[model samples]
Target: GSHMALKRIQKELQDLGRDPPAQCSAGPVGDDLFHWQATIMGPPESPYQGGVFFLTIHFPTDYPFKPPKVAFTTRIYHPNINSNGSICLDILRSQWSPALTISKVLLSICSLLCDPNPDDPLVPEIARIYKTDRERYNQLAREWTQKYAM
Candidate 1:
């Protein structure tokens, strides 16, 4: 079972190297194939624009049947991403599928940055600002992006 998981991980790694996604990159941190480090360049149209975001990914031993543990390593100010860098995403939880690759998931994160789901939020305070004072929310988000991510 572990062997099968290894094979899939290897293939995914190869694919990642061959044709990486736009504004995103990922690979093993060292000799540990199950542990990885990734980066996502913030979307140009979002408040996080020009900031570089880091994320850590841990593949489960069982692999494809289970979703990888993915979380932001860089601090971000957003409704869906909290102070702990934990992300609230459906695909990372209930919507995950074996067919989904790291590339696809990273893209999903990019889109999330562009369009946050304030209704279902990880940070209620941020969500409140995002809903009521839209301008203030953008200002704080941009300020945090500059302070932390720059």
Candidate 2:
């Protein structure tokens, strides 16, 4: 396998070094062939701030031919996210472009931490709460982050 994506991912991991608010690691318990464990810091100034998030990315056998399936191993509540941590971010869906790399996609995840696409809500009920009672929703999200992701 040429493993160019894997190589580029490793290089970016080295370049980024170890910074707080985000981390990329091999999943502790998995085949390790197609799974990665990632932790991202909550977007600053948002309710999610100071929160640590954990997620998993599972690559397909065909590599980038298909976007990796990502889910939040850690629990979180967001309008554009699901209970199981499935994301509504377009990039992970039909919007993905091969030109995008793992590092870039991961960065996109970080950005999603702060800014969500309310226009395209994944959890309508959660989204309603998020829009109707942001203060409460934000606090709840923060609480979950502490209870689980911390």
Candidate 3:
């Protein structure tokens, strides 16, 4: 309903097209600027390496003032990501700043894949495994990546 979101989103879309990030890409799903689909290449040296993960992005009517809601559409086994694929990332919530762009958000998600925040996880069990049995955590994450994020 507001033009601020539209204007900013359009600019971001154009910028992304002109100079896309190496790790991620995003665009409107079906002519809806507020609803977008995103894909991220798993960071190298991580369990998700060689995988491609999908995400859902939903911008509010008052976007830029409020952060977009983002979640993994492809199941990912990360301490900060839950079974339902909801993420517990700060930039998508309380830490949001209008200056942050969709490219930045996607890059942050890719960074999360590279470095999981086990201390502040959406899934407690996964966090415990991440802290205690890192090997098993990596194994499970890789397995999930192969199973869902191919």
Candidate 4:
């Protein structure tokens, strides 16, 4: 029931406030507990370093059983994240489990930023460049991070 969903959402919020994930933070948007906005600071050694990425989260009416919808609001140049900000992370889709938390999800996204799976890319062109020209890929990623995420 939606009642159980609400209780779970509230509990997740309390837990988040107590021990937030590193380089990430999330909370409800206005009065809607199901809608949230989150931010992820780029990993230190990644080309996206010094940038801050924004994402939107929407919990389904039967969350935990279903994965929350999450997408980047900030544009980033990455093989796994397209121009539309759609991410191609497995856990958000087929691999999702009730045991996963938003905290874990955000960390997974951060890891994606660091080590993109070019073979399973959302943007094929970026993946092509990432595979053949690593330097150029890093440069473009850094450029976009500075232009859009700073």
Candidate 5:
């Protein structure tokens, strides 16, 4: 019952399947009790929409105490996302709290695709493009979403 992340992920996947998969799905891989793979559907109405993004969430041995390292294995276009697929999402970093569930973290990442945290961006250049030339950014994002993420 206290399997907060696992329980939440299972429920979220069930709910997500009902509406058709978005950019991703969340669940454990193989027989790993903790490690999970989250596949995201690009955010609706954003360039990320219609695209499939994948992540490998590696939970530490002392999970709930340490946050999972979520790597965006699927290429994406965002200011806070680095070339190596690392993101600036806090939930997977310093801002993580045990109270946070798998569902919440994945959902937050989905939302972040549309609304980036430029102030603390990992890739400032992308952030600048996103904030300045929105149309251009969308074009590039869509292009990447299609070419790399999908």
Candidate 6:
């Protein structure tokens, strides 16, 4: 009763263990229940294919009432992702709901791998390239994924 955060996290962890997302997995880092390490496998047929991306999830003490702070720990060349790993995802921001879980967040990130929102981008240059020259964007993203994430 005193540790709602811990119990919630533990329940999510157990559910994830029982049925994990195909492209993502997450667990607490060491014994730190408030911090987690997550991984996302690049979606098939995307330029990010073959890359494995890592993420950091920081849960607020008053979680469920507030969304977790998630950032990529990998270098991904994507319009919605900056070099600093800051993501331009709405659910991580305004659209977040209490019903969302770590698995859902990871899945959303994975989906972003397949379809990027170039209009709402964290990296303007990448977004420009994504819109103006799709092939070039894909090529560069592929190269970067191979160099850094693969």
Give the TM-scores of the predictions, in the order they appear. 0.95, 0.77, 0.95, 0.96, 0.82, 0.96
lDDT of 4 by residue, 1-150 (tens): 449678888999999999888799999999999999999999999999999999999999888889999999999999999888899999999999989988889999999999999988999999999999999999999999899999
* Candidate 2 wrong stretches, greater than 4 Å: 1-31
| Tens digits of per-residue lDDT for model 2, 61-111 | 655656778887777778877887888888888888767756677778777
lDDT of 3 by residue, 1-150 (tens): 459999999999999899998888899988899999999998889999989988899998888989999988888889898877799999998999999998999898888889899877899999999999999999998998888888
lDDT of the structure predicted as candidate 1:
0.90
**Candidate 6 TM-score, C-alpha based:** 0.96
After superposition, the stretches of candidate 6 with alpha carbons farther than 4 Å from their true spots are: none
- For each candidate, what is the lDDT? 0.90, 0.71, 0.90, 0.93, 0.79, 0.90
Model 2 per-residue lDDT at 140: 85
| Model 2 Cα RMSD, 1 decimal | 3.2
**Candidate with more favorable, higher lDDT: 1 or 4:** 4
Candidate 3 clash pair list: none
Off by over 4 Å in 1: none
- Best by the TM-score measure: 4
Shift of residue 10 alpha carbon in model 5, Å: 9.6
Q: How much is 122 displaced in model 5, in angstroms?
A: 0.8
lDDT of 1 by residue, 111-132 (tens): 9999999987999999999999
List per-candidate RMSD values in Å: 1.1, 3.2, 1.3, 1.0, 3.5, 1.0
Deviation from native of the Cα of residue 61 in model 1, angstroms: 1.4
